[PDB]
Design a protein around this ligand. Structure first.
Ligand SMILES: CCCCCCCCCCCCCCCCCC(=O)OC[C@H](CO[C@@H]1O[C@H](CO[C@H]2O[C@H](CO)[C@H](O)[C@H](O)[C@H]2O)[C@H](O)[C@H](O)[C@H]1O)OC(=O)CCCCCCCCCCCCCCCCC
Ligand code: CLA
Ligand code: CLA
Ligand code: CLA
Ligand code: CLA
Ligand code: CLA
Ligand code: CLA
Ligand code: CLA
Ligand SMILES: CCCCCCCCCCCCCCCCCC(=O)OC[C@H](CO[C@@H]1O[C@H](CO)[C@H](O)[C@H](O)[C@H]1O)OC(=O)CCCCCCCCCCCCCCCCC
Ligand SMILES: CC1=C(/C=C/C(C)=C/C=C/C(C)=C/C=C/C=C(C)/C=C/C=C(C)/C=C/C2=C(C)CCCC2(C)C)C(C)(C)CCC1
Ligand code: SF4
Ligand code: SF4
Ligand code: SF4
Lengths: 154, 80, 66, 42, 733, 143, 30
């Protein structure tokens, strides 16, 4: 496929890793009784291993010669779930955190002792501001156009 | 010996002279500030360079300045 | 006549070696006695590196900003 | 009572409660959706 | 004056031992010495340059002498791939009999060291064939070192010392350096290649006795004055050609094949001769740019004055930069060190990928040693470039003469530059470390499939853009339709495409996710080392903490415990902190290079591609595994020739750890300890008849940082050099 | 006008058994210092060099190796106890040099007979850049 | 044979003369 890689559903090394991993867990399983609690734990880990390998091969992950999923972050639309889509999700969360904390610092900057509300959190004020990050890309963008995001001459 | 200088931003609080451990600073009369007194460094031959005077200056920026210069027996703090 | 700015007005500190250089503070007292090279007394919101919140400046060292 | 609530709002206690709730949430997310190197829902 | 040092009275009047140390550490700082002038400054610099040139010529002269005396050069020419070259002979009376036995190798009579600098391949490729040739070159360089000292002494007496105006003649100096020093030298080197090296590479021994009789080309010179230069490229050597012989030899002297000589695996000697000739004549024409005594040329001042963008986004542009640099020797040295460090790393990256010396690509120990050497050299040079940039800002920068130009504007927004350098270092550091730890935890829990292995697809796309097929991105040179491919098929592309897709050499090696992670660690190292040096250079004249730092100089201990504490606040301390990051960065660079090649030379590139993605693989499959033969250089059962590295290996561990003492423990503890020792000596009988003439004191705070850094760096370099060579030469592959 | 008291030898010294922090060859060939004070009674005081000594009643003379040792002991004599003190410097020739209190007034108290030394009449940030004093024996603060 | 003469001449005699002469110059007074 891309960069000489082969999809994990086609790679033999990928399937050999799944085999050897499951057979290694089965080798640990023979030591215990079929009704034992370690047996149900190892069986659950085996089922969890099958689920993991199957999910990786199903969602179009590319594999190298090592049989391990390689990620393609160039922006190719076949693999946006590998970086761009989770990255946009992160930037939404990160902007939320920064915008809410910024709203908090602005609200307490006019207090008599602003340091008091920085080492002892005003939870009521925080709880009222935590949901402004939901619309942070909008409130930030408007503050960009209105000259409210950046302090003048610093 | 180390060089010590007093700038006219001094307010005359006499704190550099109290912190000095080798009696290098003095308080002379002056007409620039309210306390009618400024600092001077007439005995920098005994100055060790501890900058304990700069740690006590309330002026921003400092009015005492200790410029570490040529080391001597007195400036190195040697008892031998 | 009162030399310097009125008391309480915001002042932009222009002394380059000051902890509050290019920042802003508030006036306390303007010493009308001449021969005083630094009459303007300014109090600041944040302490400097010596935990000092007030300093004296010259007239050409402060600018009145609203 | 008000003093007790003011203590619970101090930085370490608020951090522990906030990070404990955060740790538990991420643990349950990786419990119902383990592994996952990608965003599979497209 | 009155005593040592005669150039500093304040040091001479020091009653303590500090007089000696600071007298040595400040011998070359001409600007700080008593009664220095601009004339004496430039003149001492001029003579120091001549002394350095004499040092370099004498050093190369000695290298030739030992290779010709105790070496293997004559025997090595016959078997380039089966003879271990000899550096010199070993005569250590501490050797046991087995040490003499194990160190006798390379086909010598006594114990010898195997040379790993590559001068054998270098000298064989340029035409040197016998030990007599090396003796001739050594005498010439010994004589050249003599005339270097002669000229250095000559320009120190009156009427030979030049005025500072002569040193400030920048236009004339650039014209001659570009024309003569750069171009004429490259032109004459192309002459040596087409007269002695190329015919020497075809069986014809051309020397000073017979160079006037032989023709470098059958139809020599004629076509050069006609325009039919292509006749010099008609008959190259066959791809089945032996270097020291004539089977497959041709008659061309200037070609553009593009690949390697198949036998020697080095660049085509005709390509190198044509290369030097082309860049030479390009330097020759370029050396006529600036104005001298003939009414034509440019004024570098006026060019800098004219480059000002309207709208004022750069303010007053480059106005005043001419005198700013022409009056500051620290500015000039900063630019020189910056450019030299860049091209030094350029040499490192090109000598391993494009070997130009015959039979040097198979000497794997030599390739690893050369690349490591130049990369650490370049790392130090880069730290020095930024160090002297800060020294310029303190000692030479005039703010009024640089008013509102680009230089002063750098200071005007110093916080923006430093903060963003900090953000980039934080971003790179957070994520690169995080990904490495994630993969480490995955492989700990036995789930390799959960690693985050990002494909370095942008550099892979560039390698495909150069014609590499391993990734199949079908771009130019890798796609049959692109005009970049069609325009070059006639010339360099056959040999170039033949070499890039050969799986033996290191011309654009295959890269994977492991290479992606290491390159981001490299970006972290470059960004953070740049951050340290730039923050120190911009905050060298002043900071919010110390607004008058320029008055205290470049190197001072601190400003006291007041205002919160001001330890390591000078720009010298910024340099001192950046050298640790430089060593760490070059360490990452060289760990990367050596592991990829030592797995390539072993034919096991899969171990690197699978283990370089997690740091436990670097500790286990690189350092621990390759240290086997090294640490067994001497064991309770005997020793072999690798013992000299096992010893130096531990030697480097000692010096390095000794530097921690100077860097962790600080002065006041040792001063009080020395006081208790001075009392002990004065009160001890017999010994009190001996009196010290310099008072014992503890090392200065700045001296301690320097001594600790030097121990750290020496241990760093020696530990890695010992491991590098022992792990590579122990296998030789 | 002030007249410094001359150093009177044969003045009693505090009771002390001896310590290793005393004088060395520096006192023999270079210089040493001597602090004097009055004191009301016999007391114990910590020595700036070693342990404890018994301050004699009436005039006291104590020879030290450094000037800082004298001022440190004097400051404690002025704080813990209420004792005035002077100290001098002694060269190997026998010459004595009066040091502190110089004017007879303590240096932290303004006295009209004092002259300015090293007093620059400008803001500290008004010093010049080092290039403007290059190739001269000057510093931007000496002026 | 030449190493048996020059190796001690630079590792023993040369540092001996160099360290002694530098000691005399450094400790010299005017
Ligand atoms: C389902 C498909 C269709 C969907 C359509 C969309 C529906 C969205 C509905 C949202 C509201 C539903 C629940 C409301 C419950 C009442 C909470 C409240 O009293 O909501 C109102 C409060 C307070 O409202 C405003 O809050 C402002 C924030 O400042 C304050 O912030 C704090 C408020 O606690 C402190 O009081 C602090 O002193 C002060 O600075 C100002 O006080 C304003 O004067 C005040 O009017 O805000 C807040 O908690 C905001 C909380 C709601 C955020 C919703 C985000 C959704 C994502
Ligand atoms: C910088 C070049 C250089 C270097 C690094 C070395 C290094 C070495 N030489 Mg060598 N040598 C050199 C140049 C050099 N040499 C030159 C130009 C000659 C004359 C052709 C010799 C002749 C020579 C002989 C005969 C022998 C060595 C030997 C040795 C080895 C033992 C050390 C020794 O005896 O000191 C070097 C002794 C010398 C006499 C060389 C010094 C004379 C030249 C002109 C240098 C000028 C020295 C000058 C006074 C100070 C230089 C300033 C500074 C750069 C050091 C050692 C590895 C010995 C050996 O083989 O060990 C087994 C030995 O037998 N050398
Ligand atoms: C770098 C130059 C250098 C050279 C050429 C030598 C050479 C030698 N070392 Mg030495 N060493 C050196 C550096 C050097 N060392 C350094 C830097 C250290 C510190 C780590 C040491 C520490 C060291 C130790 C601990 C010992 C040696 C010993 C020896 C001798 C062992 C071989 C032997 O058995 O001979 C012959 C053995 C003899 C006893 C004959 C002695 C040779 C005659 C007496 C020399 C005459 C000296 C001359 C009159 C004056 C010399 C100084 C003068 C130039 C001012 C040998 C001659 C061993 C030794 O000396 O044996 C006791 C030994 O114990 N070395
Ligand atoms: C409201 C909190 C907040 C915000 C909005 C920012 C914003 C910013 N920081 Mg920053 N920082 C913070 C807290 C914050 N910081 C804290 C607490 C520290 C100490 C660890 C730092 C240390 C720091 C450094 C060293 C640097 C920045 C830098 C920057 C700038 C570049 C983005 C970045 O690198 O962020 C990265 C964020 C971090 C490295 C740590 C953030 C920790 C959390 C996520 C933020 C705190 C949230 C707060 C506790 C929530 C309060 C809740 C309230 C409602 C009650 C950016 C404008 C960089 C810069 O200079 O710009 C060029 C830079 O070099 N920051
Ligand atoms: C910046 C470094 C970094 C990065 C990018 C990652 C990334 C990842 N790690 Mg990892 N990790 C790291 C550092 C890092 N880690 C370090 C330093 C350690 C050592 C402590 C670990 C230890 C670790 C373990 C033990 C595991 C991971 C796992 C994972 C993957 C799970 C994704 C997930 O949680 O599902 C999705 C989660 C979400 C979508 C939560 C976001 C939704 C929010 C809360 C609400 C959305 C509202 C709208 C993911 C790709 C897991 C894995 O199985 O790998 C495949 C796993 O088991 N990591
Ligand atoms: C052509 C390059 C070049 C030139 C001409 C200069 C020139 C100068 N430098 Mg500079 N520098 C350079 C490159 C250069 N540098 C590089 C690459 C670095 C990065 C390492 C530095 C870092 C640097 C600093 C930090 C400083 C200078 C300073 C100076 C000035 C005074 C130097 C002096 O007299 O001290 C004398 C130098 C020595 C006595 C060298 C002793 C220390 C060496 C490294 C120990 C040897 C290592 C070890 C013991 C040997 C190997 C071990 C063994 C077992 C094998 C001077 C004008 C100083 C200055 O004046 O600042 C204003 C200053 O502090 N430089
Ligand atoms: C054509 C006339 C000419 C020539 C040939 C030179 C040549 C030189 N001048 Mg000079 N100069 C000239 C005219 C000239 N000058 C005039 C007219 C003036 C008055 C304005 C000056 C004023 C002047 C000053 C003030 C100084 C010099 C200096 C130098 C020396 C520079 C240092 C050096 O050797 O680096 C060598 C440079 C090269 C070999 C070319 C560049 C090297 C490239 C970048 C890398 C190497 C290429 C290649 C890859 C190497 C392969 C490695 C392999 C061979 C091992 C050099 C030999 C310095 C000096 O005097 O030193 C004593 C110096 O201070 N000149
Ligand atoms: C500084 C470099 C240099 C030097 C000193 C020489 C010197 C010499 N070359 Mg040579 N040559 C060089 C570079 C150099 N070459 C390069 C780079 C090439 C590759 C194109 C050649 C290719 C070449 C060939 C093919 C031949 C020579 C020949 C000669 C000899 C006679 C040249 C002559 O008088 O022509 C006439 C001089 C002029 C017409 C005036 C030149 C004006 C200058 C360039 C300005 C002569 C000693 C000839 C020879 O006799 O063989 C030994 C000959 O056959 N050269
Ligand atoms: C001073 C330093 C400066 C440095 C600057 C560096 C710049 C480096 C490059 C930056 C920009 C790179 C863009 C690369 C785009 C690659 C995608 C591409 O061109 O192919 C074209 C891509 C191909 O997309 C691929 O196609 C494949 C089949 O051929 C498959 O379907 C893949 O899944 C799919 O990803 O198509 C696009 O998605 C592009 C749509 C763009 C629409 C723009 C409309 C709005 C315009 C305004
Ligand atoms: C501090 C300071 C200083 C110093 C500085 C420095 C040190 C700098 C640097 C820097 C550096 C170190 C840089 C580097 C660089 C480089 C560059 C800038 C480049 C480039 C190029 C390009 C762009 C390319 C292109 C191409 C080609 C040509 C072909 C192929 C393709 C490609 C694309 C690759 C001074 C003294 C001045 C002043 C004072 C201050
Ligand atoms: S540095 Fe110390 S000894 Fe010197 S004047 Fe200041 S306080 Fe006195
Ligand atoms: S500490 Fe500063 S302000 Fe106070 S008297 Fe001394 S110089 Fe003046
Ligand atoms: S003397 Fe040492 S501990 Fe004190 S401020 Fe200077 S560097 Fe820091």
């Amino acid at each position: 496929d891309i960069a000489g890689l082969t999809p994990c559903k086609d790679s033999k090394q990928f399937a050999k890793r799944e085999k050897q991993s499951i057979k290694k867990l089965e080798s640990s399983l023979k030591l215990y009784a079929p009704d034992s609690a370690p047996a149900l734990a190892i069986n659950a880990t085996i089922e969890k291993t099958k689920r993991r390998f199957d999910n990786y091969g199903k969602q179009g992950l590319l594999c190298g010669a090592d049989g391990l999923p390689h990620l393609i972050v160039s922006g190719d639309q076949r693999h946006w779930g590998e970086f761009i889509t989770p990255g946009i999700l992160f930037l939404y969360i990160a902007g939320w955190i920064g915008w809410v904390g910024r709203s908090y610092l602005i609200a307490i900057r006019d207090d008599k002792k602003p340091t008091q509300k920085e080492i002892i959190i005003d939870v009521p004020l925080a709880t009222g501001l935590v949901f402004r990050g939901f619309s942070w890309p909008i409130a930030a963008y408007r503050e960009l156009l209105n000259g409210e995001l950046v302090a003048k001459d610093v | 010996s180390h060089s010590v200088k007093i700038y006219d931003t001094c307010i005359g609080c006499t704190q550099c002279v109290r912190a000095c451990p080798t009696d290098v600073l003095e308080m002379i009369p002056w007409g620039g500030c309210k306390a009618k007194q400024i600092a001077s460094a007439p005995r920098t031959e005994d100055c060790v360079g501890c900058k304990r005077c700069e740690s006590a200056c309330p002026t921003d920026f400092l009015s005492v300045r200790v410029y570490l210069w040529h080391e001597t027996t007195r400036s190195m703090g040697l008892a031998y | 006549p009162p030399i310097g700015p009125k008391r309480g007005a915001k002042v932009k500190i222009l002394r380059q070696e000051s902890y509050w250089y290019k920042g802003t503070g508030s006036v306390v007292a303007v010493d009308q006695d001449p021969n005083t090279r630094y009459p303007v007394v300014v109090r600041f919101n944040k302490v400097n590196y010596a935990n000092v919140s007030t300093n004296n400046y010259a007239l050409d060292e402060v600018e009145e900003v609203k | 009572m008000r003093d007790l609530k003011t203590y619970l709002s101090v930085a370490p206690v608020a951090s522990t409660l906030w990070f404990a709730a955060l740790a538990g949430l991420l643990i349950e997310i990786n419990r119902f959706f383990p592994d996952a190197l990608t965003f599979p829902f497209f | 004056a009155l005593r040592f040092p005669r150039f500093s009275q304040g040091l001479a009047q020091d009653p303590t031992t500090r007089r000696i140390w600071f007298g040595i550490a400040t011998a070359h700082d001409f600007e700080s010495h008593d009664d220095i002038t601009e004339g004496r400054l430039y003149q001492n610099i001029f003579a120091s340059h001549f002394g350095q040139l004499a040092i370099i010529f004498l050093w190369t002269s000695g290298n030739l002498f030992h290779v010709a005396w105790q070496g293997n050069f004559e025997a090595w020419v016959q078997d380039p791939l089966h003879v271990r070259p000899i550096a010199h002979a070993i005569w250590d009376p501490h050797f046991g009999q087995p040490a003499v036995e194990a160190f006798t190798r390379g086909g010598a009579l006594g114990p010898v060291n195997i040379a790993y600098s590559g001068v054998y391949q270098w000298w064989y490729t340029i035409g040197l064939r016998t030990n007599e040739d090396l003796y001739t070159g050594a005498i010439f360089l010994l004589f050249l070192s003599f005339i270097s000292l002669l000229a250095g002494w000559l320009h120190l007496q009156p009427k030979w010392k030049p005025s500072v105006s002569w040193f400030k003649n920048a236009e004339s100096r650039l014209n001659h350096h570009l024309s003569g020093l750069f171009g004429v030298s490259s032109l004459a080197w192309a002459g040596h290649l087409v007269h002695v090296a190329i015919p020497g590479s075809r069986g014809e021994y051309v020397r000073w006795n017979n160079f006037l009789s032989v023709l470098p080309h059958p139809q020599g010179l004629g076509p050069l004055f006609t325009g039919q230069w292509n006749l010099y490229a008609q008959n190259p050597d066959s791809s089945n050609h032996l270097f020291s012989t004539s089977q497959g030899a041709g008659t061309a002297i200037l070609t553009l094949l593009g690949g390697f000589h198949p036998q020697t695996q080095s660049l085509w000697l005709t390509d190198m001769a044509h290369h030097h000739l082309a860049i030479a004549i390009l330097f020759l024409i370029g050396g006529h740019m600036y104005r001298t005594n003939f009414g034509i040329g440019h004024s570098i001042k006026y060019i800098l004055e004219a480059h000002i963008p309207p709208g004022g986004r750069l303010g007053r542009g480059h106005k005043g930069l001419y005198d700013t640099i022409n009056n500051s020797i620290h500015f000039q040295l900063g630019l020189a060190l910056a450019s030299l460090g860049v091209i030094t790393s350029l040499v490192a990256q090109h000598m391993y990928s494009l070997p130009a010396y015959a039979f040097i690509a198979q000497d794997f120990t030599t390739q690893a040693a050369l690349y490591t050497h130049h990369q650490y050299i370049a790392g130090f040079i880069m730290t020095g470039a930024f160090a002297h940039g800060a020294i310029f800002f303190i000692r030479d920068y005039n703010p009024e003469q640089n008013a509102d130009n680009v230089l002063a504007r750098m200071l005007e927004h110093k916080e923006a530059i430093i903060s963003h350098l900090s953000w980039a270092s934080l971003f790179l550091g957070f994520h690169t470390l995080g990904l490495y730890v994630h993969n480490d935890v995955m492989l700990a829990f036995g789930t390799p499939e959960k690693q985050i292995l990002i494909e370095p697809i942008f550099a892979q796309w560039i390698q495909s853009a150069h014609g590499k097929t391993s990734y199949g991105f079908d771009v130019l040179l890798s796609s049959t339709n692109s005009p970049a491919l069609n325009a070059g098929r006639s010339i360099w592309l056959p040999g170039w495409l033949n070499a890039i897709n050969e799986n033996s050499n290191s011309l654009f090696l295959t890269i994977g996710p492991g290479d992606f992670l290491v390159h981001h660690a490299i970006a972290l190292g470059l960004h953070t080392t740049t951050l340290i040096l730039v923050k120190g250079a911009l905050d060298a004249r002043g900071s919010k903490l110390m607004p008058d730092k320029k008055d205290f100089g470049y190197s001072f201990p601190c400003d006291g415990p007041g205002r919160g504490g001001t330890c390591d606040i000078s720009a010298w301390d910024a340099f001192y902190l950046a050298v640790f990051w430089m060593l760490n960065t070059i360490g990452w660079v060289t760990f990367y290079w050596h592991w990829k090649h030592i797995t390539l030379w072993q034919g096991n590139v899969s171990q690197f591609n699978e283990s370089s993605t997690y740091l436990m693989g670097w500790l286990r499959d690189y350092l621990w595994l390759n240290s086997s033969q090294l640490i067994n250089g001497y064991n309770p059962f005997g020793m072999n020739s690798l013992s000299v590295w096992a010893w130096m290996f531990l030697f480097g561990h000692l010096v390095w750890a000794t530097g921690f003492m100077f860097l962790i423990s600080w002065r006041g503890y040792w001063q009080e300890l020395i006081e208790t020792l001075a009392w002990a000596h004065e009160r001890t009988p017999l010994a009190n008849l001996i009196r010290w003439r310099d008072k014992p004191v503890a090392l200065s705070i700045v001296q301690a940082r320097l001594v600790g850094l030097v121990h750290f760096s020496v241990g760093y370099i020696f530990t890695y050099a010992a491991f590098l060579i022992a792990s590579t030469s122990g296998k030789f592959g | 006008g002030f007249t410094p008291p001359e150093l009177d030898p044969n003045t009693p010294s505090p009771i002390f058994g001896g310590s290793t922090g005393g004088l060395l060859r520096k006192a023999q060939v270079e210089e040493f210092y001597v602090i004097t004070w009055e004191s009301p009674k016999e007391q114990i005081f910590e020595m700036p060099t070693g342990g404890a000594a018994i301050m004699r009643e009436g005039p006291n003379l104590l020879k030290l190796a450094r000037k800082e040792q004298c001022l440190a002991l004097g400051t404690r004599l002025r704080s813990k106890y209420k004792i005035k003190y002077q100290f001098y410097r002694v060269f190997p020739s026998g010459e004595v040099q009066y040091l502190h209190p110089k004017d007879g007034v303590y240096p932290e108290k303004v006295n009209p007979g004092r002259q300015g030394v090293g007093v620059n009449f400008r803001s500290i940030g008004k010093n010049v850049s080092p290039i403007e004093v290059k190739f001269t024996g000057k510093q931007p603060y000496d002026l | 044979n030449l190493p048996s003469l020059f190796v001690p001449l630079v590792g023993l005699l040369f540092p001996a003369v160099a360290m002694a002469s530098l000691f005399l110059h450094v400790e010299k007074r005017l």
